[PDB]
Amino acid sequence: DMLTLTRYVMELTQLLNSMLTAIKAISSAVVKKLDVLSNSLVINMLQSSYSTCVLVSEENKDAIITAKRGKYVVCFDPLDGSSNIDCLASIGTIFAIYRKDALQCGRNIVAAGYALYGSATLVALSTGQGVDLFMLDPALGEFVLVEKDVKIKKKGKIYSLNEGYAKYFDAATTEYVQKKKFPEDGSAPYGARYVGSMVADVHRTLVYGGIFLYPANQKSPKGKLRLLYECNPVAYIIEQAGGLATTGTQPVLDVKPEAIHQRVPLILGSPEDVQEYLTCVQK
Amino acid sequence: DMLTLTRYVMELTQLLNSMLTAIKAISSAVVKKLDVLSNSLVINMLQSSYSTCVLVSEENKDAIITAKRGKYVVCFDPLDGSSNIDCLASIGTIFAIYRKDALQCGRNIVAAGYALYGSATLVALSTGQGVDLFMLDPALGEFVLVEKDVKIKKKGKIYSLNEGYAKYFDAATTEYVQKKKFPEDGSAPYGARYVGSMVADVHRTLVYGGIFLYPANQKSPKGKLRLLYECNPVAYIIEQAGGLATTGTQPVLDVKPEAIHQRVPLILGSPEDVQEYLTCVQK
Amino acid sequence: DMLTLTRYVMELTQLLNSMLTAIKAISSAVVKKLDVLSNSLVINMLQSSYSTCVLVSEENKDAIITAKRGKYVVCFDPLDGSSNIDCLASIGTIFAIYRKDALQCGRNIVAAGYALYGSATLVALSTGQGVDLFMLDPALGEFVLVEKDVKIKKKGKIYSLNEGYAKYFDAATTEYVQKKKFPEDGSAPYGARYVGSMVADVHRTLVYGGIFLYPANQKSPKGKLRLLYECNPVAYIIEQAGGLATTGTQPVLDVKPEAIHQRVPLILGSPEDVQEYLTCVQK
Amino acid sequence: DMLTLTRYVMELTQLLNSMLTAIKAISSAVVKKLDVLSNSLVINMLQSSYSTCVLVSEENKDAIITAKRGKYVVCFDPLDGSSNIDCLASIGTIFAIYRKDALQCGRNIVAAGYALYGSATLVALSTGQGVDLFMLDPALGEFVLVEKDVKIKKKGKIYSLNEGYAKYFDAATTEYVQKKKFPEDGSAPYGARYVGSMVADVHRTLVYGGIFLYPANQKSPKGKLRLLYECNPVAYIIEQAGGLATTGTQPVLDVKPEAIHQRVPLILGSPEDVQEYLTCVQK
């Protein structure tokens, strides 16, 4: 009933330290006052790491140039999923780190992560040698490893998308959903889950497998989710766990970004699920 | 930046005290070891209140007779939603109190509640004079009122059900879902949300409005959810907040229970949403 | 088993808010890295209140002038008692607020307080209408009132001083101590308590009564404790609770400060105990 | 900024597990309701370990025989130092384990420990191969090792006793105290510390060194502290750390107990300090 503690490691080190320190602060603070507050906590923790030169934030129009300067670029969403504060659904924080220099392909990521503020604050992190899952130990004030080299199932049994947009679906989404509900091979239909908070839905996709979609649709031809600080980081994590992440027409990490608040479609998860979605597009 | 504390009140009092004490213990402990553990914490907290005579638990075949005896009956589900432990989705605890004497109509409830183990542990409670929402303050070890007399919206804009069971839907569910996605009156389609944990989905239904369904279907003609300790308590809370709860053919609280682990269909939420569902059945 | 919360009140308001916010941060962080850290947390919380113009800190040679400027002066000791970090003895934080303008008599204090970092973080605060005791509720992140208008006993039964300095005592300390151990009126001797951390010893003096001494001695003719940010604040709190605080030759709050790091002797507590000490000096 | 956890080990194992589980509960609960409550938590945690046959508690007249029976005896004080609840001084819990069978010499201890409820809950534990110090991590609900094989200084510079009992001192205490205040070898006098809570004073003695005394005196010829569940356990811990513990006339661990609530004098700490005290007795 007793434990020993040991330091763990995956300038980059100091940067992640400070990004984790901001996440701890965000955790405890979990209204748009909250967005404003989360934003400043990340920007000032990150600047003071002396590890950054450029930040892109979901809450700022323009890139933020550090005075304190280091070699890394960070694109982040400091608080995502806030339309769910009341229902205690888990909101999250998303970040990707690079060496504008924030308009690089996701291919170039050196580190990325998300935090999920649930009954425990969980962080998925990767530095390019797999995904590790941590939980925040608020007593210690430190992140404790819970799962090393997390791998996603080859094929799952859950599909995750807002089916209330059915009337707006493109033809490949319509087909794919039809296949999940009415399998043509004698298998049982997939179950459906959709929390409405991207980090909560992605995290479930990692740990139980299956597929998550926020595809193009009639109302939103480029999707809703943001390339630099939502889609690229989760595509990186999911790919490091053995999954796939596509826009429908190319890998998310291969998209050349055209603007820092650019949106793209996002389909990710277990690889054989994503590949079946892609087969619906090719038609 | 400073506060004062005052005691709040809605034998019954001692019983709720002990039910709240079990919820605190359950909270902190959030594998079927966990189910076993939650079960014993509730049974022994409840027996020692000296306020009970009969308990029905989701985890026990037979009713449990208290040796210590008082005037109240309690039907409870000590831990619901466990298929979601990993994805940090909020699991819950559900209870209803009555004065077998556990086979009474929901109409006879004297008190009911749920707890939702999210980033905060929230409890919805009613003693028949509305719904109050509390949060667990683990420092104090006590529940703090956050919202008095919670009211549900007359009509919402979210529908909540596993649409992966489409191939098994009865005709009224098929129609209703079709209406939410393809409104015939020029309105925008409803959004869809489904966490897959009944307390998390019901709680969202209370606080944002709309509708939650686990109706009859081809695989499960009596639904999945359990009348005594899942459906009746949430129907009571939702009705105390101004909503409705139906099996499709009658109010949940009016169903005469035939066995303590009986299942029924469950459709609840904003009243005009439920009434529109009922209009799909009458056809 | 349930509670309601209500806001409590004693520019000044914003200042105390920020001083309380620094105390929360200090609490959690409880090595001289820690001193450095506590210092910056107070200085930057206090500056940003936009309520200050001058700060005196135990850790800074010179007064710190705020750029952000308001009407209040604050003398503080951000972390006192650190020679006791290991033995879990409670360390503290001490502050006094005024309207150099930090060289005012204690008579001029508008507010003062201490925090004691024990199993709970306790704050004694006064704004000149008595003393209120609060505990930090780290869940809420807020201070909860536990005792209103705290009054110290007229006479206690504990005396508190480092008796290992006996060989250095001045004659009045020698006499007083002799009286506590060998009462000449048939009463039992006082008990002795000395934690070696000024805030822990003062706090015990408030809540149980008796007397606390760090008098002049041969090694230290002006005592050890610092007038601006140790002695004046605790003299203010203790006097607001009905006690007395003397240097041996005058009330602490009447001493005209000659330098911001000036030391003075300190004898405080229950009034009849202090008056008996003063009777030993007059001889 | 990240950590990994590993299980640590020093029927005996299950017993310590349950003793640690009681300490966690006691911690959080920190009035004699509290004594009653702490007592029951230990007795019922300990019985259910299925590792015990006999318990001696400070709060029970008679030994408690377990129905559930195992090979170990436990003498404990579930809550000590309660006259200090207000002043946040650390109260503690003390226990010793043996294989009446509770009237054994301290020499026979198989394990012993104390917990100190300060800003962190600390446990000193030994199973006969030195002392290890742990802190309670309430988030994890588990004890984390902070210091392995703790050793006490050969000689310290603090002496700890209620000097308000001077008029009642026996001649050897009078002499020893005189030596600490007026060293005859040109050295500086020792400093004095006395919190008035035995576990807080013993713990300081371990971690900073020096000496702690609750000797015989005129009012109390057998001292105050209790042999089975106060004096023997701390003598065991202190001796495992390289110190000494004497009654003045023999080692505490060598005293043959005559009754389960027997008192003895207690002088412990750094060995050269204890030996100097013993030199004052031999005269």
CATH code, C96: 3.30.540.10
Which H or E element spans position B234?
helix B232-240
Query: CB distance from C105 to chain D under 8 Å?
Result: no
Pair D184, D69 in one domain: no
Pair D10, D130 in one domain: yes
- Closest Cβ–Cβ partner in D10, D138, D144 for A3: D144
- Of the candidates B108, B162, B138, B192, which has an alpha carbon nearest to the alpha carbon of residue B20? B138
- Closest Cβ–Cβ partner in B3, B20, B142 for C145: B3
Tell me how close the Cα of B48 comes to any Cα of chain A, in angstroms. 28
Pair A130, A197 in one domain: no
CB contact under 8 A, A90 and B86: no
CA distance readout (Å), D29 to B140, C2, D134: 10, 17, 19
Experimental method: X-ray
- In eight-state DSSP terms, residue C131 is -
CB contact under 8 A, D16 and A1: yes
- Closest Cβ–Cβ partner in A3, A139, A145 for D2: A145
Pair A280, A170 in one domain: yes
- Of the candidates B127, B92, B76, B100, which has an alpha carbon nearest to the alpha carbon of residue B236? B127
- B residues 35-74 closer than 8 Å to A (CB): none
Amino acid at C254: D
- Contact assessment for residue C236 and residue C242, using Cβ atoms and an 8 Å cutoff: no
Q: Find the residue in C nearest to D202 (Cα).
A: C87
Amino acid at A41: L
C59 three-class SS: coil
Strands of chain C, DSSP E: 2-8, 52-57, 64-65, 72-80, 91-98, 111-117, 121-126, 132-137, 142-147, 158-160, 191-192, 211-214, 244-246, 266-269
Which stretches of chain A are DSSP H helices? 12-29, 33-48, 171-181, 198-208, 232-240, 271-281
Sequential DSSP letters for D29-90: H---HHHHHHHHHHHHHHHHTT-EEEEEETT-SSPEEP--EEEEEEEEEEEE-GGGTTTTPP
User: Among A95, A119, A150, where does a domain finish?
Assistant: A150
The Cα–Cα gap between D154 and D242 comes to 8
Query: CB distance from B6 to chain C under 8 Å?
Result: yes
Chains with at least 3 CB pairs less than 8 angstroms from chain B: A, C
CA distance readout (Å), C132 to B1, B49, B140, C252: 14, 36, 19, 21
Across-strand partners of C214? C266
CA angle C145, C146, C149 (to 5 degrees): 85
Query: CB distance from D114 to chain C under 8 Å?
Result: no
CA angle D198, D204, D210 (to 5 degrees): 100
Pair D31, D120 in one domain: yes
CA distance readout (Å), A153 to A135, A188, A193: 22, 18, 17
C274 three-class SS: helix
Query: CB distance from B164 to chain A under 8 Å?
Result: yes
- Contact assessment for residue C267 and residue C224, using Cβ atoms and an 8 Å cutoff: no
Q: Count CB neighbours of C33 within 10 A.
A: 8
CA angle A208, A209, A212 (to 5 degrees): 115
- Contact assessment for residue C85 and residue C242, using Cβ atoms and an 8 Å cutoff: no
Q: How many CA atoms lie within 13 A of B57 on its CB side?
A: 20
C84 three-class SS: helix
- Beta pairing, strands A142-147 & A132-137: antiparallel
Pair B94, B34 in one domain: yes
Q: Find the residue in C nearest to D86 (Cα).
A: C207
User: C227-263 in b/e burial notation, b at 16+ Cβ within 10 A?
Assistant: bbbbbbbbbbbbbbbbbbbbbbeebbbebebeebeeb
Q: Find the residue in A nearest to D1 (Cα).
A: A17
Across-strand partners of B246? B251, B267
Pair B182, B212 in one domain: yes
User: Among B118, B133, B150, where does a domain finish?
Assistant: B150
Q: Is D214 labeled as ligand-binding?
A: yes
CB contact under 8 A, C163 and D164: no
Q: Count CB neighbours of C162 within 10 A.
A: 18
- Contact assessment for residue D116 and residue C88, using Cβ atoms and an 8 Å cutoff: yes
- Contact assessment for residue C72 and residue C95, using Cβ atoms and an 8 Å cutoff: no
Beta-carbon pairs below 8 A across chains B and C: 80
Quick one: angle between helices B171-181 and B271-281, nearest 10? Answer: 130
Q: Find the residue in C nearest to B10 (Cα).
A: C2
Amino acid at B164: G
Contacts of A9 in chain D (CB under 8 A): 2
D146: tokens are 């902070």
CA distance readout (Å), B52 to B13, B57, B78, C110: 12, 13, 16, 56
The Cα–Cα gap between C125 and C147 comes to 11
Q: Is D40 labeled as ligand-binding?
A: no
- Contact assessment for residue D43 and residue D57, using Cβ atoms and an 8 Å cutoff: yes
Tell me how close the Cα of D126 comes to any Cα of chain C, in angstroms. 18
Across-strand partners of A126? A112
- Contact assessment for residue C158 and residue B17, using Cβ atoms and an 8 Å cutoff: no
- Beta pairing, strands A132-137 & A121-126: antiparallel
Pair B145, B157 in one domain: no
Contacts of C118 in chain D (CB under 8 A): 88-90, 118-119
Pair C163, C116 in one domain: no
B197 three-class SS: coil
Secondary structure (H, E, C), D248-268: CCCEHHHCCCCCCCCECCEEE
Pair D116, D169 in one domain: no
Q: Is B198 labeled as ligand-binding?
A: yes
Contacts of C190 in chain D (CB under 8 A): 164
Resolution in A: 1.7
- Beta pairing, strands C132-137 & B244-246: unpaired
User: Among D150, D183, D207, where does a domain finish?
Assistant: D150
- Of the candidates C197, A232, C96, which has an alpha carbon nearest to the alpha carbon of residue D87? C197
- Of the candidates D120, D126, D186, which has an alpha carbon nearest to the alpha carbon of residue D150? D126
Tell me how close the Cα of C188 comes to any Cα of chain D, in angstroms. 9
- Contact assessment for residue B9 and residue B129, using Cβ atoms and an 8 Å cutoff: no
- Of the candidates D275, A122, D143, C265, which has an alpha carbon nearest to the alpha carbon of residue B89? A122
CA distance readout (Å), B178 to A181, A238, B159, B201, B211: 15, 33, 11, 21, 14
Q: Count CB neighbours of A159 within 10 A.
A: 27
Pair C9, C145 in one domain: yes
CB contact under 8 A, B119 and A117: yes
The Cα–Cα gap between A70 and C217 comes to 55
- In eight-state DSSP terms, residue A59 is T
Which H or E element spans position A92?
strand A91-98
- In eight-state DSSP terms, residue C127 is S
Domain count, chain D: 2
Pair C243, C266 in one domain: yes
- Contact assessment for residue B213 and residue B267, using Cβ atoms and an 8 Å cutoff: yes
Sequential DSSP letters for chain D: -EEEEEEE---HHHHHHHHHHHHHHHHHH---HHHHHHHHHHHHHHHHTT-EEEEEETT-SSPEEP--EEEEEEEEEEEE-GGGTTTTPPEEEEEEEE--TTS--GGG-SEEEEEEESSSEEEEEESSS--EEEEEETTTTEEEEEESS----SS-SEEES-GGGGGGB-HHHHHHHHHHHS-SSSPPPPEE-B-S-HHHHHHHHHHH--EEEE--BSS-TT-SSBIIIIIHHHHHHHHHTT-EEE-SSSBGGG---SSTT-B--EEEESHHHHHHHHHHH--
The Cα–Cα gap between C69 and D241 comes to 55
- Contact assessment for residue A120 and residue A28, using Cβ atoms and an 8 Å cutoff: no
Q: How many CA atoms lie within 13 A of A172 on its CB side?
A: 20
Most distant pair of Cα atoms in chain B: their distance: 62
C90 three-class SS: coil
Length of chain D in residues, anyone? 283
- Contact assessment for residue D201 and residue D212, using Cβ atoms and an 8 Å cutoff: yes
Q: Find the residue in A nearest to B203 (Cα).
A: A87
Which residue range forms the structural domain that includes residue D255?
151-283
Q: What is the spatial order of strands in the sheet that C191-192 belongs to?
A: C191-192, C158-160, C211-214, C266-269, C244-246
Contacts of D17 in chain A (CB under 8 A): 1
The Cα–Cα gap between D55 and D60 comes to 10
- Beta pairing, strands B244-246 & B266-269: antiparallel
- Beta pairing, strands D52-57 & D64-65: antiparallel
Across-strand partners of D56? D75
CB contact under 8 A, A204 and B30: no
Strands of B35-157, DSSP E: 52-57, 64-65, 69-80, 91-98, 111-117, 121-126, 132-137, 142-147
Q: What is the CATH number of the domain that holds C270?
A: 3.40.190.80
A187: Cβ contacts below 8 Å, ≥ 6 apart: none
Tell me how close the Cα of B168 comes to any Cα of chain C, in angstroms. 44
Q: Find the residue in B nearest to C5 (Cα).
A: B5
Length of chain A in residues, anyone? 283
Length of chain C in residues, anyone? 283
Q: Count CB neighbours of C110 within 10 A.
A: 17
- Contact assessment for residue B277 and residue B213, using Cβ atoms and an 8 Å cutoff: yes
